Write a protein that binds this ligand. Structure first.
Ligand SMILES: [Mg+2]
Ligand SMILES: [Mg+2]
Ligand SMILES: [Mg+2]
Ligand SMILES: [Mg+2]
Ligand SMILES: [Mg+2]
Ligand SMILES: [Mg+2]
Ligand SMILES: [Mg+2]
Ligand SMILES: [Mg+2]
Ligand SMILES: [Mg+2]
Ligand SMILES: [Mg+2]
Ligand SMILES: [Mg+2]
Ligand SMILES: [Mg+2]
Ligand SMILES: [Mg+2]
Ligand SMILES: [Mg+2]
Ligand SMILES: [Mg+2]
Ligand SMILES: [Mg+2]
Ligand SMILES: [Mg+2]
Ligand SMILES: [Mg+2]
Ligand SMILES: [Mg+2]
Ligand SMILES: [Mg+2]
Ligand SMILES: [Mg+2]
Ligand SMILES: [Mg+2]
Ligand SMILES: [Mg+2]
Ligand SMILES: [Mg+2]
Ligand SMILES: [Mg+2]
Ligand SMILES: [Mg+2]
Ligand SMILES: [Mg+2]
Ligand SMILES: [Mg+2]
Ligand SMILES: [Mg+2]
Ligand SMILES: [Mg+2]
Ligand SMILES: [Mg+2]
Ligand SMILES: [Mg+2]
Ligand SMILES: [Mg+2]
Ligand SMILES: [Mg+2]
Ligand SMILES: [Mg+2]
Ligand SMILES: [Mg+2]
Ligand SMILES: [Mg+2]
Ligand SMILES: [Mg+2]
Ligand SMILES: [Mg+2]
Ligand SMILES: [Mg+2]
Ligand SMILES: [Mg+2]
Ligand SMILES: [Mg+2]
Ligand SMILES: [Mg+2]
Ligand SMILES: [Mg+2]
Ligand SMILES: [Mg+2]
Ligand SMILES: [Mg+2]
Ligand SMILES: [Mg+2]
Ligand SMILES: [Mg+2]
Ligand SMILES: [Mg+2]
Ligand SMILES: [Mg+2]
Ligand SMILES: [Mg+2]
Ligand SMILES: [Mg+2]
Ligand SMILES: [Mg+2]
Ligand SMILES: [Mg+2]
Ligand SMILES: [Mg+2]
Ligand SMILES: [Mg+2]
Ligand SMILES: [Mg+2]
Ligand SMILES: [Mg+2]
Ligand SMILES: [Mg+2]
Ligand SMILES: [Mg+2]
Ligand SMILES: [Mg+2]
Ligand SMILES: [Mg+2]
Ligand SMILES: [Mg+2]
Ligand SMILES: [Mg+2]
Ligand SMILES: [Mg+2]
Ligand SMILES: [Mg+2]
Ligand SMILES: [Mg+2]
Ligand SMILES: [Mg+2]
Ligand SMILES: [Mg+2]
Ligand SMILES: [Mg+2]
Ligand SMILES: [Mg+2]
Ligand SMILES: [Mg+2]
Ligand SMILES: [Mg+2]
Ligand SMILES: [Mg+2]
Ligand SMILES: [Mg+2]
Ligand SMILES: [Mg+2]
Ligand SMILES: [Mg+2]
Lengths: 57, 137, 76, 190
RNA sequence: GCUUGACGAUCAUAGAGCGUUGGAACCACCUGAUCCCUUCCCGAACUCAGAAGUGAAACGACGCAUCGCCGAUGGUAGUGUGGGGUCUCCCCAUGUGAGAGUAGGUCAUCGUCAAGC
RNA sequence: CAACGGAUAAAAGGUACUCCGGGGAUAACAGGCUGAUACCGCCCAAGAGUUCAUAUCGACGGCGGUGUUUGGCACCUCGA
RNA sequence: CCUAAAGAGUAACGGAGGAGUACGAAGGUGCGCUCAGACCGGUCGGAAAUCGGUCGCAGAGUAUAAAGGCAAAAGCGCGC
RNA sequence: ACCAAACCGAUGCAAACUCCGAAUACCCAGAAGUGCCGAGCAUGGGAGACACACGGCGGGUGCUAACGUCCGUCGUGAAAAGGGAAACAACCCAGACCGCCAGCUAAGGUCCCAAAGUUGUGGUUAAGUGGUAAACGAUGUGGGAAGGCUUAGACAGCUA
């Protein structure tokens, strides 16, 4: 259904593709959380930037 | 020493020396071999220095193979010359060595004589070596 | 040094890839020789340029003897 | 004597196979042949290295024990680390009563010291090859093929066609119209 | 469904090599060079008029893995991202993954039309 | 018009007698970085030493150290 | 052509070579045809001339460097 | 009794070799959401700039020397303060609208200088190794798997 995604690392100095994956989920600032639909094309943005996020499932 | 009879091109780029030796890593002709365990570079005067020391020790029978051929030319820039002004001239020929490559082989002698003949050779080479024996696989 | 010469690059290669929509007159490949051959609806220029003569979609199929690479236009 | 213990393997890949050789001291392997599907197994590095110190390891039938079910196999190929020399992978071939199979059999050279070319002319024996590849039924696979050099003179060459083989054994290379030198007598180096 | 010709689809798992076999029809060889037509010479090839002979050559069909060509599973090499080291080179986590070789396959599979059963 | 986007139809030199505007954007001296070279150690041991490799030396080859020569670079200083 | 990192592009007083033309047929079209080389046999030539046969299939050729192409040959000959 | 094209088999190498051949990166299309309320494109007004630096990765050159030099692609400085690396543009963490004598964390740390464990469990080192270093040398010490001899008396010592 949905999944909790939290940003736990700074976006400074990351690849421009990884910045767009965090921005394409709606995440802005460290410790900010969003509720995104569990779609196959939402998971692809989570997997590409796995090292910057925390996924509470 | 050892160098090609003729080559297509005079000079060459430096390149890189990476990877292990999955080819040329078996005892294929003799019964015992000297094998490289570290990577590096052999300059065709070390190969000749190590061939005399090995052959002078056996001095009675035995066949010897050299499995390395120095075919890469390297250049040097003369002293008191600035940077630029074209590539330098070829000074000596050299071979690329990856870990696991067999350098010398011998047969027709005992294991104890070969083992101490390969120790004299290894003292002339700038890289780590080991003693190996022929196997079926 | 007696070597410092070269010529300008010619910008050769594939200009439209498989599945793209084309119009008549569009240049498909820039070549020396024929790496690719003209299939259906494709013409050949005097410098071996492949161009479209109909509207459709690029195909890029390998067929026939000789193992030749063909470029053709198909229905969209 | 020739027995090996194996366990079924289920985690395949480069990363999984590297963990076997660091954490557990195991060796990846595979069993194929007969009329059955291949099967990935694991086996201890210490056990495979101990069995391979024997001479006729590659020319003898080995009883493999995968789980609790035993089966008859034969070492067909073997991957080694190019530098350190230890075994990294091994594949076995299933053995069936009526089916020709190909194996590598070592050669044994006897009575070298009493050779005519050695004691008379002062020649030296040179082994050009050390093993031959044969094809035969499993029931008559020899552990080693015999070659003698008593009646060999200086300059004489021994070929594949000269040496005799056990009944029911084919030399493969001789079958393809290509006989290769095995040994010779030549003049002294110095 | 059976055999032979024409045109295709597909370009070796379809090829090469060896052996056997086919003239009822078709096809091929065949006879002659008057007549259209031809050879930088030659009816060899192209062409014309059929028809006495043969399946020899060619072509087709059927067999065999000897050569060729295809070819796994597993492992290995390389590699995108993140992180380490003793940092000319490597390792770890995660995703991806050959080439060579091994077991083994292969003496093709189809469509339209016309002549005889 | 090859100095090949071609200053004009038409053009070479000297300055230690020199002068102005600038530059550590760029050389010479000294400093820095590096260490090919230089110097000093060590490894192997064919051999020399009547015999005996290491008393004393040591060929063919290998590994370092020091900033110490000849160099490489152009980071500081051309309102010295 | 390489460097050039499997789309394009990409620097050095980096590594290698060519051009400043040729052709009224060396262009168009119709028709027709396949090379280099090897072996055997054959008057003076004899390893290499022209002739016959088998194999070979592109290891030849392409006005001119190198790269990419070439059987509907883009290679070769004849009529218009 | 020397040399030997060619062939057969075994065995290596290649920036300007290729029977093969990735990952990634590039075009194209169709879709969900996000976008600071825009991102793209076009046309006009005004510019500045065309001396770049270091770090990682792929390379040429050099000696796979240089805080050397010449490209490709990222990051930072330029034009970026704060914390850490003793000090230390370019490294690591993190992007400062203002105020607070409130709290939680990152990199890095917790004996004293100096804020926080003289914290707990199991091992190793005796070298102040830690807190600079190569070929090569050595009965330093911990662990593992195996071997050769041995009450038919092993090894060292000694009596022949
Ligand atoms: Mg950061
Ligand atoms: Mg960063
Ligand atoms: Mg280089
Ligand atoms: Mg170019
Ligand atoms: Mg045209
Ligand atoms: Mg794998
Ligand atoms: Mg990995
Ligand atoms: Mg695989
Ligand atoms: Mg990485
Ligand atoms: Mg794989
Ligand atoms: Mg494969
Ligand atoms: Mg293959
Ligand atoms: Mg000019
Ligand atoms: Mg100009
Ligand atoms: Mg210009
Ligand atoms: Mg221009
Ligand atoms: Mg003017
Ligand atoms: Mg003047
Ligand atoms: Mg002045
Ligand atoms: Mg002034
Ligand atoms: Mg300066
Ligand atoms: Mg300047
Ligand atoms: Mg000076
Ligand atoms: Mg001074
Ligand atoms: Mg100075
Ligand atoms: Mg100085
Ligand atoms: Mg100076
Ligand atoms: Mg002496
Ligand atoms: Mg003395
Ligand atoms: Mg000084
Ligand atoms: Mg100096
Ligand atoms: Mg300066
Ligand atoms: Mg400068
Ligand atoms: Mg500079
Ligand atoms: Mg100063
Ligand atoms: Mg000054
Ligand atoms: Mg002043
Ligand atoms: Mg490119
Ligand atoms: Mg590229
Ligand atoms: Mg380019
Ligand atoms: Mg540029
Ligand atoms: Mg022409
Ligand atoms: Mg060509
Ligand atoms: Mg004509
Ligand atoms: Mg290549
Ligand atoms: Mg790519
Ligand atoms: Mg807003
Ligand atoms: Mg504007
Ligand atoms: Mg500039
Ligand atoms: Mg400026
Ligand atoms: Mg730049
Ligand atoms: Mg610059
Ligand atoms: Mg820079
Ligand atoms: Mg670099
Ligand atoms: Mg560089
Ligand atoms: Mg550098
Ligand atoms: Mg610089
Ligand atoms: Mg860079
Ligand atoms: Mg920046
Ligand atoms: Mg930073
Ligand atoms: Mg910063
Ligand atoms: Mg500035
Ligand atoms: Mg800062
Ligand atoms: Mg910024
Ligand atoms: Mg601070
Ligand atoms: Mg700071
Ligand atoms: Mg410090
Ligand atoms: Mg501080
Ligand atoms: Mg740090
Ligand atoms: Mg806290
Ligand atoms: Mg922490
Ligand atoms: Mg602490
Ligand atoms: Mg305190
Ligand atoms: Mg405290
Ligand atoms: Mg305690
Ligand atoms: Mg200390
Ligand atoms: Mg210390």
């Amino acid at each position: 259904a949905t999944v909790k995604v939290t940003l736990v690392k700074s976006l400074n100095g990351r690849l421009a593709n990884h910045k767009a994956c965090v921005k394409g989920l709606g995440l802005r600032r460290i410790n900010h959380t969003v509720e995104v639909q569990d779609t196959p094309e939402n998971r692809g943005m989570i997997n590409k930037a796995y090292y910057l996020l925390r996924v509470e499932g | 020493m050892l160098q090609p009879k003729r080559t297509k091109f005079r000079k060459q780029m430096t390149g890189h020396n990476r990877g292990l030796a999955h080819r040329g890593s078996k005892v294929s002709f003799g019964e015992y071999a000297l094998k490289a365990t570290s990577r590096g570079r052999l300059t065709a005067r070390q190969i000749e220095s190590a061939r005399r020391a090995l052959t002078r020790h056996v001095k009675r029978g035995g066949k010897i193979w050299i499995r390395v051929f120095p075919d890469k030319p390297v250049t040097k820039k003369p002293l008191e010359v600035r940077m630029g002004k074209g590539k330098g001239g070829v000074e000596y020929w050299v071979a690329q060595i990856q870990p696991g490559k067999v350098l010398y082989e011998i047969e027709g002698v005992s294991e104890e004589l070969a083992r101490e003949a390969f120790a004299l050779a290894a003292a002339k080479l700038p890289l780590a070596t080991s003693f190996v024996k022929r196997t079926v696989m | 040094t007696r070597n410092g010469r070269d010529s300008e690059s010619k910008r050769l290669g594939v200009k439209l890839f498989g599945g793209q929509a084309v119009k008549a007159g569009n240049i498909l490949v820039r070549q020396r020789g024929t790496k690719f051959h003209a299939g259906y609806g494709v013409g050949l220029g005097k410098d071996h340029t492949l161009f479209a003569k109909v509207d459709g979609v690029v195909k890029f199929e390998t067929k026939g003897a000789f193992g030749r690479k063909y470029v053709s236009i198909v229905a969209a | 004597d020739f027995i090996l213990n194996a366990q079924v393997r289920s985690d395949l890949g480069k990363g999984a196979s590297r963990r076997l050789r660091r954490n557990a001291g195991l060796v990846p392997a595979v069993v194929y042949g007969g009329d059955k599907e291949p099967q990935s197994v694991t086996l201890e590095l210490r056990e495979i290295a101990k069995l391979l110190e024997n001479e006729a390891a590659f020319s003898h039938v080995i009883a493999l024990n995968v789980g609790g079910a035993k089966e008859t196999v034969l070492i067909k190929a073997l991957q080694r680390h190019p530098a350190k020399g230890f075994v990294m992978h091994a594949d076995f071939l299933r053995v069936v009563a009526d089916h020709k199979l190909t194996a590598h059999v070592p050669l044994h050279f006897i009575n070298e010291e009493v050779a005519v070319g050695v004691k008379q002319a002062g020649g030296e024996i040179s082994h050009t090859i050390s093993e031959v590849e044969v094809s035969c039924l499993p029931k008559d696979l020899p552990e080693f093929i015999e070659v003698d050099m008593a009646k060999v003179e200086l300059g004489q060459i021994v070929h594949l066609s000269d040496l005799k083989a056990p009944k029911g054994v084919e030399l493969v290379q001789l079958a393809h119209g290509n006989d290769l030198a095995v040994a010779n007598i030549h003049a002294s180096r110095v």
